[PDB]
Amino acid sequence: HWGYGKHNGPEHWHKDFPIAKGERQSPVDIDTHTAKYDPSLKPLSVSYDQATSLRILNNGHSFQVTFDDSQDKAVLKGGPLDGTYRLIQFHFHWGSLDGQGSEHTVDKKKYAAELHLVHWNTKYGDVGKAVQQPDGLAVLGIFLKVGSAKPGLQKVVDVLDSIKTEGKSADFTNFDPRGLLPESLDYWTYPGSLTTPPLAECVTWIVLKEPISVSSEQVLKFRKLNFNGEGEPEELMVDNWRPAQPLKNRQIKASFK
Ligand SMILES: NS(=O)(=O)c1ccc(-c2cnc3ccccc3c2)cc1
Ligand SMILES: [Zn+2]
């Protein structure tokens, strides 16, 4: 099936998911001089104080932390959004080297990794229905650069040993995702897609201007995870990112001047 290797990677996905060549695909390059400041954009509202994490899991393409989304516990509102989006999971994309790994780029610059906090629009009732709607999901994207450690990320790094291979999961309760956010909530926003199959064009992208810094030891532990399942030939989980896609008939808006 699909992956990130030479024979099943992003250049192959369109054969099983022809929307890969669609009109609003993600990620994209964010050209900061062409993005337009939109003074009508509201401030983001990130309400994570009641977030209830459940599990952390290696799904063979990334690792993700899942949340209880059966109530309005951790929600994203405001910014470009109408209505209320519940946090379902977060995951990362990262590189084999510090100079690559992010999916979005900024003036063609690549960051060492990118964090995706995935939310879905409660008016559609469940995430499966939301992914079939043009305004069904809202993904908050946060760049990672290598520098000082991010203390709020360390509890995630600590547990990666226990989910080395595809299919492994572990308890990951009482994790506070507010510890992954940068200081500023300034953002770029554009309509796009999931960046993995099924590549559904259901995502309002909200990409934060300010990266977070993580330490080389923290990102190194990402790179020790495995694409493969236990007992199979070891393939390190690195470079699980989709490259920038054509912007086509879209404008990126900025919340800040
Ligand atoms: N990398 S990303 O754009 O943030 C991303 C990519 C794919 C998903 C995803 C995958 N499978 C799904 C199946 C059912 C419902 C929602 C899904 C979302 C969710 C998030
Ligand atoms: Zn992602």
Short mmCIF file of N, CA and C and ligand atoms in Angstrom, two decimals, residues 91-93 103 116 195 205, ligand 2:
data_model
loop_
_atom_site.label_atom_id
_atom_site.label_comp_id
_atom_site.label_asym_id
_atom_site.label_seq_id
_atom_site.Cartn_x
_atom_site.Cartn_y
_atom_site.Cartn_z
N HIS A 91 -0.08 14.50 15.31
CA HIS A 91 0.99 13.66 14.78
C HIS A 91 2.04 14.59 14.20
N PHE A 92 3.14 14.00 13.73
CA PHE A 92 4.25 14.77 13.19
C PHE A 92 4.68 14.23 11.83
N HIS A 93 5.34 15.10 11.08
CA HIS A 93 6.12 14.73 9.90
C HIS A 93 7.54 15.23 10.11
N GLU A 103 6.10 19.70 5.85
CA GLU A 103 5.28 19.57 4.65
C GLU A 103 5.03 20.94 4.04
N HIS A 116 0.94 18.47 13.35
CA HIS A 116 -0.43 18.65 12.90
C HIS A 116 -1.38 18.29 14.03
N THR A 195 -2.91 15.62 3.97
CA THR A 195 -1.64 15.40 3.28
C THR A 195 -1.25 13.94 3.19
N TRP A 205 -6.67 24.86 6.52
CA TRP A 205 -5.34 24.87 7.10
C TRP A 205 -5.09 26.17 7.85
ZN ZN B 2 -0.05 15.49 9.03
#
